[PDB]
Amino acid sequence: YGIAQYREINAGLPTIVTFPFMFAIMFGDMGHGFLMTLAALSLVLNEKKINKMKRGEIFDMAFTGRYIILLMGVFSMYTGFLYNDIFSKTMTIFKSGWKWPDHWKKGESITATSVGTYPIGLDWAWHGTENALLFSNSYKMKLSILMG
């Protein structure tokens, strides 16, 4: 973007964390984030050999930023945990705060009742529901506003 002034607050120090984390917020997937983490780790652990060998334009890039991609992948895994989004699915790790009705006929629209709060991440009872978008969209818009 541009070269900072002499003895000016460096923009590269907060970027290290903010840039991968904003990328993770936009990305938000624990399965795709895991694939990114593995792709970056392949470069990170084998960085000596890649440094020794010649690299192309697309290979020199994404290797000088191998740690960038590693941080983006780790943060994407974290956000996907906070979204409960593993390869577009959901993880039922904890107990949901939503309780479905005791009994209902097949094909009958049912609304869950609140019992508690989900400890970490979005509730997995929000997966496949009709109003899943109405909740996730508000959550993500307010998340964007707050973290911006």
Binding site: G28, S136, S144, I145, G148
Partner: protein, 53 residues
């Protein structure tokens, strides 16, 4: 604060042709600041947009 940010620095420069340049540059900075306030806050919704996509 809008007149504050637009005027106080040029006023200090006047009360320490350069005055006109400073005054115009401060106007440009003020207008860009006020515009990109709402512009940046609105454009941070791209986080939600890309997450949803």
């Amino acid at each position: 604060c809008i007149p504050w940010l637009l005027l106080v620095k040029p006023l200090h420069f006047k009360f320490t042709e350069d005055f006109g340049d400073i005054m115009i540059h401060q106007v440009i900075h003020t207008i860009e600041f006020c515009l990109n306030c709402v512009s940046h806050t609105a454009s941070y919704l791209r986080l939600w947009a890309l997450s949803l996509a």
